[model samples]
Target: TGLSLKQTQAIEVLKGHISLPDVEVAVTQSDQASISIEGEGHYQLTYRKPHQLYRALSLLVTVLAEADKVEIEEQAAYEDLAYMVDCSRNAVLNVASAKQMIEILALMGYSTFELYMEDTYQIEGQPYFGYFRGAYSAEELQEIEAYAQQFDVTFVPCIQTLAHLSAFVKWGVKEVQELRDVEDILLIGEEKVYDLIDGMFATLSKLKTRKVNIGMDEAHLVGLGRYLILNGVVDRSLLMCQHLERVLDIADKYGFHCQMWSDMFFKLMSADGQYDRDVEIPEETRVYLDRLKDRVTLVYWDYYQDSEEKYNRNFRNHHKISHDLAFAGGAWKWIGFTPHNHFSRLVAIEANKACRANQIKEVIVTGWGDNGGETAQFSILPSLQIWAELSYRNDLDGLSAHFKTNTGLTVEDFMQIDLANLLPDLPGNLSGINPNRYVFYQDILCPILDQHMTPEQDKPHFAQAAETLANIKEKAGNYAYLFETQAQLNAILSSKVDVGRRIRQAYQADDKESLQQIARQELPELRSQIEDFHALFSHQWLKENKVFGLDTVDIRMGGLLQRIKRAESRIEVYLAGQLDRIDELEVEILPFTDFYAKDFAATTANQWHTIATASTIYTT
Candidate 1:
């Protein structure tokens, strides 16, 4: 194959990582990849195409690092040119940030990018579509598409067409409400639903791949809500297939390839009616899966689980419905301010391996910023790299070095973020979902509930986590500030832990001296530290994101500051002998020790995560 100049540049990015100093490289256009190392004096490297060359070189890095006898041949499990970025839920990344992201992926042999937006982009004549939700402009998305092409990457638009359309349907506007079904889903029979879908297509009409992901997954009350009211209770499978057919018609008219989440089919189709695992699909359900079969690509998306066998079982079940399979594994930056990148990689690794066995056509590593998208998208680089290596079967081992080599960031530094989850990994974690979020969004001022109370042991673990972060401060360099800010959060919380406990202990001890001392000292620090931490968080948000979501964080911190000040006032009044009462702190809060880590949710009086479930995003 005649390698284009652009292809040469991509190859050079791959060469920068591996040592092939003397080998003569030749590129060919084929379905597979090969490496020639016959002669003792000279060696030859041959790959299928530009991306295959990139994949081959990455595999070589693993071969040279691990093998006494190198396996010179490799076959990719799937044609992976896919990664998704969240531009919804108040965490929309700017086009400039996307271009920078594209640059990083090109070297890792990634070929496609999915911008997962749910009512977060502009559309013609639809003024209320993404109103006040920080949606991207057409000019911005076009810029992203053009930039991705230069690096040989395809940009796909992933938008909600069904249940997750809460941002638009819940807007309280009458025109938007006409399409609502039960809750957060589109009315299947309504013409306005198709009109809205058309607007979305027209806005993204210029996509290079013309591939669109119409999110039709998890739309509760699909036929039970508005659909039933409008058109009596018909089978949900029929309504879903009918809705998809119309959407795919619009997609086909534009010469676009449409993809939608496969969960709804499994949920509606399976006999036990479980979408999460392999259950026998009833004849009626299989009939529905067939209606949307060739018309659309079914993207089976799962991220919360940690088991490979479960993933394989689900993959086989999906294959039962649609033989042409696709997968969406999480890159795991979604939980909160800190990413569960460690958890993200483990699931992605297993899912990609399943893709290879399943012969799935595409593999998309989803970088979702659920719950305000507080964690930086770049934080998931190690996990993305791990997927790339797994997809190409390149360097199956030695992922940490590959991460540092690829993005100048150490795995150890990044994994430090996971300590928030790891430390809280109690015995009976229901989902083993990242508890870093629960800890990070945890209420500072103590209440009378044990579940709401911080454990005394948490102070030491948080302190140690801070020390671990401090050790990486120099290694993190520019990114060190994230670690530093997080460390400061941990350090403050270590002392600020059990705010009411310390005060009540002193009050009960008849130690008026210690009580006064705490009122003057620890209480004030709690008040000030909340504001200080908010300031640091705001600074990062302003630099990395839009101004929309900052208010949520600001209000939460302000709430804590108010609580701290009130506690101090109560202590002052009691100490003054004017009012001989501190009623609230007097009660010993019972422990939520029986509660599982996955259910560990903080109850702050603003919008935040309850559990790391999909319900958090639907909190409108």
Candidate 2:
């Protein structure tokens, strides 16, 4: 097939508009150019080529416009999008998958890709931190970076700084921790820790980028109490300050700017402190922020906001605190790694807008592996689009429409991306499963309200539903089953189960007496029976599959156990709270037994059992 005269003319026109030095113009395949464009010189193009040509033309226009400007329009937002794909957690993404994501993200206007090759950067060598099946070498990373650079994207290296260096611990990197006495906690005060950080810096310095995110979040048990018990200093805040300052100094010396999480300050301060909703800044953690404000950039991430009120509140707090501290705020919003889950798009757009409005320009749409590794990244496509639209345009709504139409995807499409592809070796049969499963698991749960619950009962069922949901959630914490079974569970929850529906109806009718009875009698019985079913189901499976017995099962086998533990913990807490509420109900209504025994008990028991049995079977 040959191109028409019009097609040749179009190629000439495109070449004249944009300077592609590496691209060669050829009439035939006989030409020996390093870069060549093959097209119908005179024949009519197919639908696919025309579509591609349209995208090429669009890209050409953008490049031409930018080239003509001297400053590249500083106002024209520059989004340095980066993601940390942690292979150490569980699954590792192959090179092809990584490159595909790179190409797509580059097209979406992202300028950075971060491979969080924590312990998975290499496999052949006895690398101090290496601990996974498939790993990338420094050379491989360089190759990946070069490919990314061709598309104007920079590949950055990410390493855990203070806490998550447990990968180092697991690999027998003793110097990476401060206190040799403490287990599972990284000791920041140790000189060996600095040496390890310096080595990581040296290794990463071989790459191109000058920016690094030193993960310093969730150092929950910092050995402060241990240090206090062993020695005398109870206040290790200064120790933290020193550790971070030293890391920043080293990073700055290498012409790199460092970034870290801001959650620890909040966690430590709010551990037992009083919270005053009137003020955005917690009084207890103000000093820590003030001290570190001048050093490293703080990423204030709040990815779980569902409602407008909560969203606005988080925005205001993050904005005010980060702005007040005069620190660069990297508004960390998350999109799972895959291109599914409806809420990812919604959260992305809303969060991006909030960041822009608050003047927190620097943003990183985080793709967390959450111990599930690369599978987490599979659900992040919608989040990436959010980043893309926000980076290219000032209008949020315009970005939304552009993403929706261009990809032939919708907010609902997010509910349907295949997660099995992301985690092929995972247990159970995910083939023929709907993508909506991942959506309900990641987006709906307690974080976003029950997505499976009918819209009618959603608001009303919050109180009773929260605990059961929380239990299933806690149990499934590290299990891939959580993601797998999410859609089905959500469907069940949202469906018209008589008991759950009636409870919601009772609550709606302002029948507190009935609600309390449901909580007391129906809910408890249902939860107990659900636990029994889960126990039996797990035992039965283990017995039938001899390979899954306690002695033979690997880390993957513990997921069921984790889910059961979480369920037990959550139910215990919910039951305790419900009992307290029952006591209060006794005071509020006259002769509590009449209402509680007759109306509440029967309805509550029936509904609880129904929902629980259904949920247990679905998970199993």
Candidate 3:
């Protein structure tokens, strides 16, 4: 007998389902079963076994069996799945954390886990060395690989090959210096690059993964004139091409297939940017992609653009270019560290869905721990959840309902967690501040004190500590109202119950530690703050103003937030160290100085000296 539409619908019905009256599930039949859902609702389910695909298949079958009255078409089955966890820029999740994330990813139907082991790959006690993050040992990597394999998810190791070798440079590996024909390239050397890559691959080979992502992207200093002058290289582009070829050869020798960032090749093809038209691609460079095209895959990362206009344009352009070039294009989009930001989550979902629709099969969602890993993993849970659903189920609303039902949380709850976690680190949302102030504070003052503070100092107080502390307090108080107003605005926009009241209480208290704790307790309110801030500041009124340019305001706002976050992080470290000290039978009072002490002091001193000068500009 032909499979009835009703039977197919029943197969897809969620297990342990709650009857959501508003939701209507429509089933249609073609050669394969199809289920179309439209509604507002929530459903809950539990898997009897540990197998993610088995559980998902079980639910799919149950839904089809129950909804026997509906017509059906083809059901969307799990295809190639990939997960990317960047362990380079801080925020290293432990094995337990990684396992939990993988389980969730598997549940969402991902078939691969790209363990982005860039810069972080060394044994703590072993002679091998690399970037900090308790570098995963061979044994640890194997443990993860074994666990992922159980759920039928392949673990692919990713390492930065040509650039982003600063991690290697920090460990005193100098080979990276050989590739430095440009200042940016010089920033991190060639020998270090090779060592890091070799170390990473050697470690991964122990685990026996067949593929690795040799990240060769954003070499902004490619073909730098300064390095060319020093090295007597005729063409810097040729030099860069040779370096990439060298890395490719290394990866090939190990029976490992290589994948690199496609941006450089894209730059070579389109001379629309800074590269001179006269500087032709080296003969070696022309065949480089073709030679490796069969051997290597190219991952195209495009997470910078925030709007549909920007995203679609870049997406289409990248897809077309990579496709025409005959290279496998992996559409890499980022999940904003903010977990519950519906705007970001929606953008990710739409972007992934659009890419899939466009026949861009290899989709990789990258989660970035930008600037010292200030935000916690729990904060990004919402985005991760949505990312998995979009990548696997292709059902956005269903994913949303699933999150709500399982966590007993709303999208707002996730956002709150993000904002709350971020609050302690945010310097009172200094979006209204001048960029020059940040440049001075961050570039000059902060670094000086940060550098001067000794490893043994009970509480590091560099030059002008008291003044900087006072300045932060003054600035924070002056902008207290702005924070209050924004907090109120968020509550109204999300239609969140009692969020504004909580915000008011948090602000009135003006206790950073208390607010931080509150954020942990009520994450929804914090999420509301972020949503409100993004909406309010991301508008044309703010974007167009020279005083508030995106580069100036947006970047500086992020910097200010980072400073506060760094201070909080430092304080936590300090407290922890103190506890250790106490255990060693030492006693000392750890000072509670303001985090932005250096910045405040420097700004104040500069302002005072400028005012003291006998000039109208100075007086003004």
Candidate 4:
């Protein structure tokens, strides 16, 4: 019965996750990490590192809370079990949220934590970098890194060096224009671009950790932009190799180690510009690969496909370029407001097997915030639990018990977040289809998705989903707002899901009484429910993120609420004979596609602009 600095920290961390006042935790020196529970909640934890102490204690508490387990010996399948959060998209996590995540990672035994910041970190001389966005200051970055070290978690600063700098580049600043290659890709071969990149590393050098993710992914038009106008028709792969040489040199100057996304290399070498394709490597590419493989690592990322064979093949393709490879898979957080927890778990399970077989040492599960970053980061917790279990135990036998202990909620209770997007009988429901987003935002009076609505089919799903969510909200504890918010959303959809269809049907039958009731009763109730949902959602967002991105949420929800009020007024006037025939309702609705599918159902329109109107949003 002895205690050290790590043992004391482990006690604090355990208390944060569970009620351990009556329990005693003793730490022992050991070659392997493990937790052995004595009767009446007394425990012994063995660790080789400080981080292992927290992991072992977490396991001990989870088993004590959920099962009659004695001990568990932990073994890691990968050298680095990581999670990369995409903060470049609008919703950059605040300091508290970042720390919250670090605690979870510590409990799960993750060794690496990456924040994908494209233009979201402060560089010494660049005012435009992360301007008006919630960019982390140098001091803030150092503070977070220090906190992570307490748990032995390597805090890797992930940034875009070559592409996806649109966040600040769209400002059209004088320097940005000079550095723009085309769209988001940085101008290649420009002295100014390299100078900017040099400043990036210089700023990051303040931190104790030198491991960096120098993002060079998806520079599709590498030599086709300002670089193209400067050098005529150069090979894109040659351009990528040239840029990598300069970027790695800058990193070397800062005494940093780096890994970049592997897509661009595969895109350049494959005939069809696909990353997962099987193709012959070019002589020029092979020559460049020989020198760069020793200098940098290539990260192979695939989140869409759930097939293990495909993952195996992709790992084989990655070995063709560099044996020093890492794998990044998705938790399906970017598609829309709803998180695909089931889909993400399925893909990660398959990907983890491939990683173990191929001996891929680093596994990074990414939560991208694509579109508007509408989805919450914590929504990916179940998926993160799956990633951790697969990496440590090599199976999912204890996934539920571990998840319940890690989060103060059961796995089934937590998975109710999936109800926001799932319809069990629908095709591709579990394949990451998100109909709730389109249904929530689509215009009620002149909806583009009307043809696929089928009120009888879709209405019942929302009704049952709302009921289930309402039941789960009570058990969500501190995260009750998440369940409550989705509950209100499903309830709104339960009432509003079929309003347009009802209106059309009433008008066709000249059922004036029915039309009057919808205009008077249903519309008012829906508007109020939507208002409640917005308030709950706003509360949920502000608790975990900065106030900067909530404006987008307000605009979309406010816009929808106002439109509903307008539609309600229009219908009431028509029923009262105070206005002429409504024209928007007169136009016959058509199928979303010319040839309707057998079920007459379509996948949810994933983008807000697409669901908002049938008109064009972009003007070239």
Best-to-worst ranking by TM-score: 4, 1, 3, 2
Give per-residue lDDT, candidate 4, residue 315: 89
Residue-by-residue lDDT tens digits, candidate 2, 1-620: 34446445444443422333332222322212211222321212121222123223324334333343211111224334455555444444556556656655654456567666555565333455553434566787677777666555667666676766555565444333343325455566666656666766766677788877777777776756555566566444455666677888778767787777666645544544222122334443356557666666677665544434554565555544455311121212122222334445445556655565556646666654443331334345556656655555654553434344333334233334333112222222111112122222211111111222233433234323334334443443222233333322333333223343454354445575655565566544544444443343343223222111123123332333343344334434445564332221122212211222321111111111122222453243
TM-score of 2: 0.54
lDDT of 3 by residue, 1-620 (tens): 22244333333332222223333333222232222222222222222222333224323433543453332222443345466776665445567667766655654545678756555677333242453345676677888888776665678877776566555444333344443444334322346445545555666677767777777776765655445455553444456556766776777667787667667655654567432123344565556545545566666565433444544555555543245211121222122212224434646744665566456656666655433332234334456556656654666655555555433345443344323112222243221111111112221102322221221221122112223323332433312222233233323222222222333343345444644554444443434454455455444222211121134235444543454344344434434454232111121212222334433221111221221122253233
Best by lDDT: 4
Candidate 4: misplaced stretches above 4 Å? 1-3, 21-23, 33-43, 65-69, 427-430, 576-580, 591-602
User: Who is ahead in TM-score, 2 or 3?
Assistant: 3
> Over the full model, what C-alpha lDDT does candidate 2 score relative to the true structure?
0.44
The global Cα lDDT (0 to 1) of model 4 is 0.80
Q: If scored against the real structure, what TM-score would every candidate get?
A: 0.85, 0.54, 0.55, 0.94
Q: What tens digits encode model 1's per-residue C-alpha lDDT throughout 1-620? A: 35787766655554544544444444555544632222221334565544455545554554455443443665656665588988786777766668767766765768787788898889878788888877888788888888777666778888988888767776787888887887788888788888888888888886567888888878757889867766786877767887888888887778888888888877776676678766565566567667769778888888866667778888877767777678888776776666666667667766766767777888888887766776766667777788877776544464666666555666766777665545552432223344344544444334433354446566787789878877775577556667766766776757665555667777778788877877788878766766776777776666666677566667656755676677777778888897776766566655433434334442222125332111234345
- Provide the lowest-lDDT 10-residue window in model 4: 32-41
